[PDB]
Design a protein around this ligand. Structure first.
Ligand SMILES: Nc1ncnc2c1ncn2[C@H]1C[C@H](O)[C@@H](COP(=O)(O)CP(=O)(O)OP(=O)(O)O)O1
Ligand SMILES: [Mg+2]
Ligand SMILES: [Mg+2]
Lengths: 396, 542
DNA sequence: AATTCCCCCCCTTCGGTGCTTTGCACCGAAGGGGGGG
């Protein structure tokens, strides 16, 4: 069996340089690729193949085993082309089913697009090039060629247990039940066994939106009122109806920032009305499947990060916090990587699409250190923001 | 001979045809050298005579090798290169002697006539047609086509690098204890065996290479130290760069300055303290490469310092995987940094510098982080692992910066070393307004037609000023207004701006800017004892 | 006016992109050097 895969019209293919890797990662990649070539999953190629995608290795959580990962984002973009009850389940377990992927041969006209290069320590030898002969882990057309086989290893359980909702994204099966955990963790063992003969728990309901909140204090100084007016004017873009027209009248004339301004009755009324408006959810935003998701992350300090997922500016589909109380990993890069992975997982759970990330980090630091903490099998598209936010206290 | 290795299939780009470029006139000495080279190549089967059936041509020429007694025949395959299919290069970097481990026995081998020993794809040979012009015109030219990899073709290096890898794979698999560094046709071979057994293994490798049509002439077979390998001299315990010659010219041109900067950058890999910023600044603004550039006083002082560094004999050491990598960083001033990677004190594995200027405005902490990232990536390339850093920044300073910075930033395992100058932030912005300090409400306006603008402020005590500005923009007027606010205040000041450009720069704690308004504000911010800056939405009634 | 190719690096310049304070800041590609074959 072979599916005639094709690229998007007028698209060449991935040509991405291989980034340097550590000695442990290179040794793991060499061993994994030697085993894969011995099994025929990958084949050595020469330089006449002009395409290339980056490759590296990760160590999944509580695994102590190296896994080879390929950055197929460019190939996914160039390739020629949701369980809504999943967000409401209580326990969603993620299972790696990328191993069953390496048994379906890939179309020979498409193998050249899956080329990758293993580098060498100290450039002692030229990089070793391979291409995939089978469906690779990381490519978006790979789950689109196993759908048939998946919806047949699944049917004998997706019907015996009609309550459990199963979704598949890339190499991951998100299986979400409403059973007691001890039970959901036995069904999942049963599903594992039922995938063994045929060949990480999320809690989507304990997920909350972070609302826009105004400060509550006894006395309001000029600085406090100026900060409140700025926050309310910024929020007026998101929530139309925010007056902030009489709170901008207590700030009339030149006054010291530490001067206490008594809050007038009209000002207090308007403040209470604006608090009520901010408390109620924003109405009028709908997930458009044709558009792409954008996730913005803001560092808040003390291991706190805020994030907003939206498709149009100021129309937020989700707002949240990733609070990893800076403890042993006082690594900003580790916290940011862990936040990106969590946001991507909830985006796939809710909308089925990974978001494009606006990372609050220098590009070079990210490319240096993100592979050291990544533990997912997917990689989202990310762009790097090089401008202070200030609208960072408007989300925390 | 010619390798029995399989040829790499090569095709032209879709819809394109072979080159039809005429041969340019050639010097009679060059013509004779090319005639003799082509005669020997045709006798060996490396090139084949062709007739009218081939409509393609490509200019040929010759240069002088490092042998200075033999000629290197080159073909100007630029048209064919443009019409040739794309390749992926397998050479991802350059080996470094600092990444070499100590070996009891070392042998350097150079494969003779490397490219011309690897056959070329038969369907692609017709596109490699060239013509050797006759001495003094008159007779028609002898037309050949390449049967092997030509020098000048964009596919030759990668194809040769793959062929050499394939040839070396069996020997390396059957001798896993022998270390072979393969860079094109250059082969470094290190082993811990005795000299007799090592020479036996070297002879075995030479026989293995000769069976694949690759000769290893004794002329370029090095058996005794020092070994000339990849631009370095390798001794049993130490390595050094091959001698680096700095011009002693009294008149410098743009090209000469570029050459000197490149040579000093090359020498900075092992010679500590090499600085090039003053000399590199001479290249800005210039145009012609032949334009004589008068060396400034700062440039002359850096050149003298670099010369004083390069007269002493320095050497690197070989990597010891049992011990730990330590990279120590020092500030050189003016955004320049040196670093030394070593495993034992006073025995450097390698040396380097970082002087890249990223961003219009930055501080020493950001540049130190950039230098740490550069050293980390270089160490991952060379030794495959991140070193332990000795940074001239206090842990408190880094803690304050990275906790109070709006970007995610990190530095790997590092310890503070008390070697001045130390990396520190030169001012801090108050998190809350200062009680008892005059509050400045500042603003800057500029119509974008006449390029004239206003910078003004008023204080809570009644003072105000409205300086006018020429040829400034809105951004620049807001920066000017903040500058007035800083100038006309005491040691403690509250400033309220309605500009997020201004506040965005000033909040990143710059210590140096590629602007004199930001640089001037920086000196005012370092003098004040406490400064709170606040943004207020603009036209709102505030 | 001498004409080639591939690889790594540094340093400087320019045009494109993104945001929207329309100038300014930033990043990649391309030019010059160094080194390697
Ligand atoms: N300037 C240049 N232009 C194009 N290609 C160049 C090159 N310098 C080296 N190369 C490539 C081709 C050589 O085959 C190969 C080996 O580099 P080499 O300079 O040692 C000469 P090789 O042809 O092996 O023969 P021999 O002189 O040792 O007998 O490196
Ligand atoms: Mg040589
Ligand atoms: Mg040679």
């Amino acid at each position: 069996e072979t599916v005639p895969v094709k690229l998007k019209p007028g698209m060449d293919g991935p040509k991405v340089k291989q980034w340097p890797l550590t000695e442990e990662k290179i040794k793991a990649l060499v061993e994994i690729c030697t085993e894969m070539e011995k099994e025929g999953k990958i084949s050595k190629i020469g330089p006449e193949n002009p395409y290339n995608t980056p490759v590296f290795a990760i160590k999944k959580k509580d695994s102590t085993k190296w896994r080879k990962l390929v950055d197929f984002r460019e190939l996914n973009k160039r390739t020629q082309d949701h369980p809504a009850g999943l967000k409401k389940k209580k326990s969603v377990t993620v299972l790696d089913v990328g191993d069953a992927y390496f048994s379906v041969p890939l179309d020979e006209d498409f193998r050249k697009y899956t080329a990758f290069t293993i580098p060498s320590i100290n450039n002692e030898t030229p990089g070793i090039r391979y291409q995939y002969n089978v469906l690779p882990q990381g490519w978006k057309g790979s789950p689109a060629i196993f759908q048939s086989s998946m919806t047949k290893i699944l049917e004998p359980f997706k019907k015996q247990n009609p309550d459990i909702v199963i979704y598949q994204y890339m190499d991951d099966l998100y299986v979400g039940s409403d059973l007691e955990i001890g039970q959901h963790r036995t069904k999942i063992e049963e599903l594992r066994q039922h995938l063994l003969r045929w060949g990480y728990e999320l809690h989507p309901d304990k997920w909350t939106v972070q609302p826009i909140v105004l400060p509550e204090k006894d006395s309001w100084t000029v600085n406090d009122i100026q900060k409140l007016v700025g926050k309310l004017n910024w929020a007026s873009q998101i929530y139309p109806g925010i007056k902030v027209r009489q709170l901008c009248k207590l700030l009339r004339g030149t006054k010291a920032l530490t001067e206490v301004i008594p809050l007038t009755e009209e000002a207090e009324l308007e403040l209470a009305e604006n608090r009520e408006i901010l408390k109620e959810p924003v109405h009028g935003v709908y997930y458009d499947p044709s558009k792409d998701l954008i996730a913005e992350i803001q560092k808040q300090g003390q291991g706190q990060w805020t994030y907003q997922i939206y498709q149009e500016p100021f129309k937020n589909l989700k707002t949240g916090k990733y609070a990893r109380m800076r403890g042993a990993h006082t690594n900003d890069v580790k916290q940011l990587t862990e936040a990106v992975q969590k946001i991507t997982t909830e985006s796939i759970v809710i909308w089925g699409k990974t978001p494009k990330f606006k990372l609050p980090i220098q590009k070079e630091t990210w490319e240096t250190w993100w592979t050291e903490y990544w533990q997912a099998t997917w990689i989202p598209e990310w762009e790097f923001v090089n401008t202070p936010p200030l609208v960072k206290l408007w989300y925390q | 001979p010619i390798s029995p290795i399989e040829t790499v299939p090569v095709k032209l780009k879709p819809g394109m045809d072979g080159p039809k470029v005429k041969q340019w006139p050639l010097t009679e000495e060059k013509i004779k050298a090319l005639v003799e080279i082509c005669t020997e190549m045709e006798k060996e089967g490396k090139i084949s005579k062709i007739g009218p059936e081939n409509p393609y041509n490509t200019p040929v020429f010759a240069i002088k090798k490092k042998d200075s007694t033999k000629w290197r025949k080159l073909v100007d395959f630029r048209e064919l290169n443009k019409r040739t299919q794309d390749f992926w290069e397998v050479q991802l970097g350059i080996p470094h002697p600092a990444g070499l481990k100590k070996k009891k026995s070392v042998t350097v081998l150079d494969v003779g006539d490397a490219y011309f020993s690897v056959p070329l794809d038969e369907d692609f040979r017709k596109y490699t047609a060239f013509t050797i012009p006759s001495i003094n015109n008159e007779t028609p030219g002898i037309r050949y086509q390449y049967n092997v990899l030509p020098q000048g073709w964009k596919g030759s290096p990668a194809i040769f690098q793959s062929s050499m890898t394939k040839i070396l794979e069996p020997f390396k698999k059957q001798n896993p204890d022998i270390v072979i560094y393969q860079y094109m046709d250059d082969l470094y071979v290190g082993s811990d065996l005795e000299i007799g057994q090592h020479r036996t293994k070297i002879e075995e490798l030479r026989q293995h290479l000769l069976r694949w049509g690759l000769t290893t002439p004794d002329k370029k077979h090095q058996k005794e130290p020092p070994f000339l390998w990849m631009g370095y001299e390798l001794h049993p315990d130490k390595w050094t760069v091959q001698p680096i010659v700095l011009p002693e010219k009294d008149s410098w041109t743009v090209n000469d300055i570029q050459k000197l900067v490149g040579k000093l950058n090359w020498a900075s890999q092992i010679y500590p303290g090499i600085k090039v910023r003053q000399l590199s600044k001479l290249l800005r603004g210039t145009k012609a490469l032949t334009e004589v550039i008068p060396l400034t006083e700062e440039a002359e002082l850096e050149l003298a310092e670099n010369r004083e560094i390069l007269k002493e004999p320095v050497h690197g050491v070989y990597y010891d995987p049992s011990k730990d990598l330590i990279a120590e960083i020092q500030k050189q001033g003016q955004g320049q940094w040196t670093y030394q990677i070593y495993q034992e004190p006073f025995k450097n594995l390698k040396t380097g510098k970082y002087a890249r200027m990223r961003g219009a405005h930055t501080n020493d902490v950001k540049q130190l982080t950039e230098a740490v990232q550069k050293i980390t990536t270089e160490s991952i390339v060379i030794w495959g692992k991140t070193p332990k850093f000795k940074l001239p920044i206090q842990k408190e300073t880094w803690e304050t910066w990275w906790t109070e910075y709006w970007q995610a930033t990190w530095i790997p395992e590092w310890e503070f070393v008390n070697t001045p100058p130390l990396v520190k932030l030169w001012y801090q912005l108050e998190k809350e307004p200062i009680v008892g300090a005059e509050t400045f409400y500042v603003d800057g306006a500029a119509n974008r037609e006449t390029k004239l603008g206003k910078a003004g402020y008023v204080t809570n005590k009644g003072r105000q000023k409205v300086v006018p500005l020429t040829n400034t923009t809105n951004q620049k007027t807001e920066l000017q207004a903040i500058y007035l606010a800083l100038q006309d205040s005491g040691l403690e000041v509250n400033i309220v701006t309605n500009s997020q450009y201004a506040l965005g720069i000033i909040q990143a704690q710059p210590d140096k800017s590629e602007s004199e308004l930001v640089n001037q504000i920086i000196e005012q911010l370092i003098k004040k004892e406490k400064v709170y800056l606040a943004w207020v939405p603009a036209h709102k009634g505030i």
